[PDB]
């Protein structure tokens, strides 16, 4: 009766403040007009007037904005709308309850190898499916490994960046980033099978591969790439980190013609049913705790907020 929806920000209520970075913010929202009213979102918004300045933050932000919207797949964020105002980008997408997945490990310490079995299948089918449309990355790292409600993966950031602090490899954490990205001789398709690797390593022992005592350090150490195996592991995950952990990007596993299908084959997920795996049929091994916010603070509270981008607007279907 009246229309259909122009989607506002005066749609949505501000309940609590999830994430705040240089160029915008995370709020957990609450739609509160039409539609759904009453579902809880996560809504991230950005500056534009800042991101124009620059055109490598430019190409993320309409890229972001781009995968959400054309790459649809379980074990990725969904994006329900998006809008914009002068000065403001929004985008609302689902609300992610179960929070970062390397939270679990600071309270398990380490992980099972069957628990991170199931954490990393789900994953690879992420980046597996992120390949056949052609999209590669770079820098996954456990905080871009989410949890629904029920305690499936899904990832997470595929536009700018969250730091406040700018110093764009080189902001944040680079543990889990390729050397190849590090002597900047590109990227590749086989760079994500990389990154599945130090978070395997991570997933069992608690710290990525190569630490340093400081980023120089780091940066050497990972390039010199000696690889400590804890003795605890079984011969099959010592099989599959010794091939993805490679430091020649030719010799990885999931470099191959087919993949992500390659990976998936190693004797490691010989007990994965990928068919219910992928319909989100197998329990998870974590099931957290819809509003719950608790594993994201206490660091985050007090909710308030601050040419080209057409076709930015957009609502999602179904
Ligand atoms: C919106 C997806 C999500 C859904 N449900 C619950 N948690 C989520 N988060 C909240 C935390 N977030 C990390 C993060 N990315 C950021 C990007 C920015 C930026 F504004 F781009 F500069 C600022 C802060 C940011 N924090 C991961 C996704
Ligand atoms: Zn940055």
Redesign the pocket.
């Known amino acids: 009766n009246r229309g259909p929806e122009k989607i506002r920000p005066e749609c949505f209520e501000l309940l609590r403040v999830?994430?705040?970075?240089?160029?915008?913010?995370?709020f957990q929202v609450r739609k509160v007009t039409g539609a759904n009213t009453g579902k809880i979102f996560?809504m991230?918004?950005?500056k534009k007037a800042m991101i124009v300045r620059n055109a490598k933050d430019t190409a993320h932000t309409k890229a972001e904005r781009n995968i959400l919207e054309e790459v649809k797949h379980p074990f990725i964020?969904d994006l329900i709308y998006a809008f914009q105002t002068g000065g403001k980008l929004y985008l609302i997408?689902?609300?992610?309850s179960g929070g970062e997945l390397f939270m679990q490990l600071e309270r398990e310490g380490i992980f099972m190898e069957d628990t991170a079995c199931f954490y990393l299948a789900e994953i690879s089918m992420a980046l597996g499916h992120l390949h056949q449309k052609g999209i590669i990355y770079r820098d996954l790292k456990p905080?871009n490994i989410?949890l629904n409600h029920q305690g499936h993966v899904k990832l997470?950031?595929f536009?700018?960046?969250?730091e406040s602090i700018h110093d764009h490899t080189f902001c944040g954490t680079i543990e889990y980033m390729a050397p190849e990205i590090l002597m900047r001789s590109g990227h590749n398709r086989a760079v994500d099978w990389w990154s599945l690797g130090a978070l395997m390593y991570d997933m069992l022992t608690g710290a990525p591969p190569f630490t340093g005592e400081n980023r120089k350090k780091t940066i050497d150490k990972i390039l010199k790439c000696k690889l400590n195996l804890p003795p605890y592991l079984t011969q099959e995950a010592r099989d599959l980190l010794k091939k993805l952990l490679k430091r020649n990007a030719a010799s990885r596993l999931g470099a191959g013609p087919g993949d992500a299908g390659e990976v998936q084959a190693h004797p490691f997920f010989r007990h994965i049913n990928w068919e219910e795996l992928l319909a989100r049929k197998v329990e998870p091994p974590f099931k957290p705790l819809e509003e719950d916010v608790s594993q994201?603070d206490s660091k985050f509270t007090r909710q308030t907020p601050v040419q080209v981008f057409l076709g930015f607007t957009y609502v999602a279907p179904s």
Not at 18 to 25: D, F, I, P, T, V
Not at 93 to 96: K, Q, S, V
Request: with cysteine; glycine share 18%.
């Open positions: 999830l994430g705040k970075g240089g160029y915008g913010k995370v996560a991230k918004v950005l964020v997408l689902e609300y992610l905080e989410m997470t950031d536009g700018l960046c969250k994201f």
